[PDB]
Scaffold this active site. Structure first.
Site, PDB file in Angstrom:
ATOM      1  N   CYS A   1     -13.280 -27.920   5.949  1.00  0.00           N
ATOM      2  CA  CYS A   1     -12.049 -27.248   5.627  1.00  0.00           C
ATOM      3  C   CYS A   1     -10.872 -28.198   5.472  1.00  0.00           C
ATOM      4  O   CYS A   1     -10.697 -29.104   6.284  1.00  0.00           O
ATOM      5  CB  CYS A   1     -11.764 -26.296   6.768  1.00  0.00           C
TER       6      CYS A   1
ATOM      7  N   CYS B   1      -7.481 -27.952  10.774  1.00  0.00           N
ATOM      8  CA  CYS B   1      -8.672 -28.782  10.845  1.00  0.00           C
ATOM      9  C   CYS B   1      -8.369 -30.245  10.707  1.00  0.00           C
ATOM     10  O   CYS B   1      -9.180 -31.065  11.096  1.00  0.00           O
ATOM     11  CB  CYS B   1      -9.704 -28.279   9.834  1.00  0.00           C
TER      12      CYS B   1
ATOM     13  N   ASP C   1       0.837  -1.194   0.000  1.00  0.00           N
ATOM     14  CA  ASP C   1       0.000   0.000   0.000  1.00  0.00           C
ATOM     15  C   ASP C   1       0.881   1.257   0.000  1.00  0.00           C
ATOM     16  O   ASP C   1       2.131   1.190   0.024  1.00  0.00           O
ATOM     17  CB  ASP C   1      -1.041  -0.007   1.125  1.00  0.00           C
ATOM     18  N   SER C   2       0.248   2.422  -0.066  1.00  0.00           N
ATOM     19  CA  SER C   2       1.033   3.642  -0.211  1.00  0.00           C
ATOM     20  C   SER C   2       1.515   4.218   1.087  1.00  0.00           C
ATOM     21  O   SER C   2       2.395   5.085   1.102  1.00  0.00           O
ATOM     22  CB  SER C   2       0.225   4.716  -0.923  1.00  0.00           C
ATOM     23  N   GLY C   3       0.882   3.793   2.172  1.00  0.00           N
ATOM     24  CA  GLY C   3       1.151   4.344   3.493  1.00  0.00           C
ATOM     25  C   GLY C   3       0.185   5.422   3.885  1.00  0.00           C
ATOM     26  O   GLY C   3       0.036   5.696   5.075  1.00  0.00           O
ATOM     27  N   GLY C   4      -0.484   6.031   2.913  1.00  0.00           N
ATOM     28  CA  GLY C   4      -1.331   7.166   3.218  1.00  0.00           C
ATOM     29  C   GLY C   4      -2.485   6.907   4.171  1.00  0.00           C
ATOM     30  O   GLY C   4      -2.805   7.760   5.010  1.00  0.00           O
ATOM     31  N   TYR C   5      -3.133   5.759   4.048  1.00  0.00           N
ATOM     32  CA  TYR C   5      -4.311   5.505   4.853  1.00  0.00           C
ATOM     33  C   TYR C   5      -3.944   5.342   6.315  1.00  0.00           C
ATOM     34  O   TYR C   5      -4.620   5.869   7.210  1.00  0.00           O
ATOM     35  CB  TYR C   5      -5.047   4.251   4.383  1.00  0.00           C
TER      36      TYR C   5
ATOM     37  N   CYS D   1      -7.718 -27.386   5.670  1.00  0.00           N
ATOM     38  CA  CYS D   1      -6.456 -26.879   6.212  1.00  0.00           C
ATOM     39  C   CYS D   1      -5.803 -27.836   7.229  1.00  0.00           C
ATOM     40  O   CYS D   1      -6.437 -28.729   7.809  1.00  0.00           O
ATOM     41  CB  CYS D   1      -6.593 -25.459   6.810  1.00  0.00           C
TER      42      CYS D   1
ATOM     43  N   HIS E   1      -5.938 -21.315   9.984  1.00  0.00           N
ATOM     44  CA  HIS E   1      -7.248 -21.768   9.532  1.00  0.00           C
ATOM     45  C   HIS E   1      -7.986 -20.651   8.805  1.00  0.00           C
ATOM     46  O   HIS E   1      -8.580 -20.866   7.769  1.00  0.00           O
ATOM     47  CB  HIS E   1      -8.096 -22.292  10.690  1.00  0.00           C
TER      48      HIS E   1
ATOM     49  N   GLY F   1     -11.788   4.283  -1.038  1.00  0.00           N
ATOM     50  CA  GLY F   1     -12.768   5.079  -0.320  1.00  0.00           C
ATOM     51  C   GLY F   1     -13.954   4.281   0.180  1.00  0.00           C
ATOM     52  O   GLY F   1     -14.940   4.852   0.640  1.00  0.00           O
TER      53      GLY F   1
ATOM     54  N   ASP G   1      -7.958  -7.744   0.219  1.00  0.00           N
ATOM     55  CA  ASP G   1      -7.063  -7.959   1.357  1.00  0.00           C
ATOM     56  C   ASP G   1      -7.820  -7.543   2.603  1.00  0.00           C
ATOM     57  O   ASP G   1      -8.673  -6.659   2.526  1.00  0.00           O
ATOM     58  CB  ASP G   1      -5.809  -7.070   1.271  1.00  0.00           C
TER      59      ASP G   1
ATOM     60  N   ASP H   1      -2.588   8.431  -2.498  1.00  0.00           N
ATOM     61  CA  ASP H   1      -3.782   9.252  -2.661  1.00  0.00           C
ATOM     62  C   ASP H   1      -4.156   9.898  -1.361  1.00  0.00           C
ATOM     63  O   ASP H   1      -3.472   9.743  -0.350  1.00  0.00           O
ATOM     64  CB  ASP H   1      -4.959   8.454  -3.249  1.00  0.00           C
TER      65      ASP H   1
ATOM     66  N   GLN I   1     -11.320   7.457  -6.608  1.00  0.00           N
ATOM     67  CA  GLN I   1     -11.974   8.068  -5.443  1.00  0.00           C
ATOM     68  C   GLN I   1     -13.311   8.659  -5.863  1.00  0.00           C
ATOM     69  O   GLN I   1     -13.780   8.392  -6.967  1.00  0.00           O
ATOM     70  CB  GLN I   1     -11.029   9.068  -4.793  1.00  0.00           C
TER      71      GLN I   1
HETATM   72 ZN   LIG Z   1      -9.363 -25.176   8.779  1.00  0.00          ZN
END
Ligand SMILES: [Zn+2]
Ligand SMILES: [Zn+2]
Lengths: 372, 372
Positions: free
Chosen positions: B307, B312, B92-96, B309, B338, B220, B270, B146, B193
């Protein structure tokens, strides 16, 4: 697989190397046992603990009985199933942590009542209940319940607690033998007491050998006496125990303590490594370092230059420095995996050197480099 | 391998599935990116992140620039080398995070100055410096810097920040293109935006397409508007962006938000999942559960019944309940593995269903069960 068979393959001086065969696996000795507190070895999956080379882990009875509870663990299939470690587990008796961590303790010949440090709820331990809890957990090596002697101790107080501990050793033996499934599948270790006093250590060894155990711990050490005194007491205490059973030094210790204890006939060890930045301590063959130190912020070398662990294969000091400074969980994971791997590599080197008749040389070389 | 090639293999309605090929690997879309904050995806080794199915992770510029520092990471060989993840990384840009986490912010047309939340030290970000930091980290997908618009925003304020953001998008484009190594090896995404306003969203899309980017985020959103409004804005906003480039919805989100956003043409996601017991939240196909709840204390089933994973496969709800209640690091490790695995399985099911022309059915079935 037998319930319990300790075999000594090679000796050098008072040092021994060999195996304990148990139903859930073989333990190579001298052995280091990573410590699982509340049913987990801190920050490690069981598979990672095994990958470091560990053959057996320790479980803390005191923590387990408070949370999640012994009966609950039994209902859920036992500690091995619950936490996903299928190899041997040694459980302590709970007594030491009652004394060190709990409050409002009342002690008598029957046992100890105490308030949980978590919620002030009232609990009890006794030889019988401790053995029962260790049965409910399903551990493979059960420790007799004893009464700890603080350091320093007067001869009178050391005798009294040693005598009580021997009475409780017999109660522990009979409780363990009273339960068929436990007697057939697990082992029971007794604990020698007597503080720093040779005559009390002898009386305790004789009492324990008379009762008969599968292994013998040297209790009452690593409680403030310092290494010279610890070694002095081991010098006369270990030979009093039966030669043909494992000798366990509980809660020890730093690498140099382990090497010197093996030189004195100890076969098994455990300890936990975090206060005041100490979570940053990493073992290296050139001595410990504290990875938080600013000198590591740009150091691209692994924690240790020779260590075979996965952490040293993949990450730098600089990265782990950053993680620990940032309070990141991955920092704790990596540091713990490396340190336990380092311990297991130490134990492997000890075993190999005894097997090759060059342990005294190994010990000298280890110290010269570790303390350079 | 190309610097950047987005290919759409299959479509259903506004949903798409395909691949982004980059030098460090292929990203399957729609994609979920686990978030690495301070150069670590919380409680997971990179190999474990990969084992969940992740193709790319996000790195937070704001955190990285504060600790360990961008220049330091560059000196050490870049973020991939430092943390041991060799696949693509989007930064990311860091701005947020400057706006959400830092103090004493002064904002102008040149950028933002701010005090670190760690030690009150003074820092700066600007289109140029943000792009430079992302270059020093070595990330593969770079976000334009931004100016965020809070929700709710008046039309005037939303227009002003959109206009500023478009000016900064051009500055970001030129900064990125100014650096040969970055321009040749990384990709640059612009951010639309305009708050909830269709006309501003259109102006922003047109400005960004005029400059030209490798991908386009819908900025936004997920800032308090709620799902109905988010979806309403996506309904008109996503079609304004170039069809043939990836569409990224930053910081989204819960499983149902992801499914509905894919239905509206989003390709990348994300989010980070811990306050007030929320570290206990586990995703299941039958909806989220909070593993801390006492009802799980003796539940031997895995977190989720289907699941695939590793968590599990190996551990019960009862055990993970215990670990989280006990504050154990292994609890955080297992829960995170998980949950990220669950997200990746969700994305795989989305991809497969679009590829098979049955995504609308999948979405209906997913909702009917998840919200039963
Ligand atoms: Zn799992
Ligand atoms: Zn190592």
């Amino acid at each position: 697989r037998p319930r319990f068979s300790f075999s000594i393959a090679a000796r050098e001086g008072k040092a021994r190397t060999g195996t304990i065969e148990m139903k859930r696996g073989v333990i190579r000795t001298p052995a280091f046992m990573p410590v699982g507190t509340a049913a987990t070895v801190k920050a490690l999956k069981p598979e990672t603990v095994r990958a470091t080379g560990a053959d057996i882990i320790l479980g803390n009875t005191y923590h387990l009985m408070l949370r999640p509870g012994a009966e609950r663990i039994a209902k859920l299939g036992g500690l091995h199933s619950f936490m996903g470690w299928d190899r041997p587990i040694l459980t302590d008796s709970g007594g030491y942590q009652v004394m060190s961590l709990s409050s409002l303790t009342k002690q008598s010949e029957e046992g100890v009542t105490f308030k949980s440090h978590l919620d002030g709820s009232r609990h009890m331990l006794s030889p019988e209940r401790s053995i029962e809890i260790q049965h409910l957990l399903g551990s493979d090596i059960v420790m007799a319940f004893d009464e700890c002697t603080p350091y320093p101790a007067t001869p009178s107080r050391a005798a009294s607690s040693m005598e009580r501990s021997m009475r409780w050793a017999k109660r522990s033996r009979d409780a363990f033998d009273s339960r068929k499934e436990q007697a057939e599948n697990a082992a029971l270790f007794g604990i020698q007491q007597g503080s720093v006093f040779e005559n009390l250590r002898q009386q305790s060894a004789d009492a324990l050998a008379e009762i008969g155990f599968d292994g013998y711990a040297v209790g009452g050490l690593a409680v403030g006496e310092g290494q010279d005194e610890m070694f002095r007491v081991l010098d006369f205490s270990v030979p009093m125990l039966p030669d043909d059973k494992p000798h366990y030094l509980m809660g020890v210790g730093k690498p140099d303590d382990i090497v010197g204890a093996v030189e004195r006939g100890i076969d098994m060890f455990d300890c936990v490594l975090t206060r005041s930045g100490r979570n940053g301590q990493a073992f290296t063959w050139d001595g410990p370092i504290n990875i938080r130190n600013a000198r590591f912020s740009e150091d691209l070398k692994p924690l240790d230059s020779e260590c075979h662990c996965a952490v040293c294969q993949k990450w730098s000091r600089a990265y782990i420095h950053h993680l620990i400074r940032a309070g990141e969980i991955l920092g704790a994971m990596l540091m713990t995996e490396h340190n336990i791997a380092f311990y297991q590599q130490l134990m492997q080197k000890i075993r190999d050197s005894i097997s090759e008749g060059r342990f005294s040389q190994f010990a000298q070389d280890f110290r010269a480099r570790y303390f350079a």
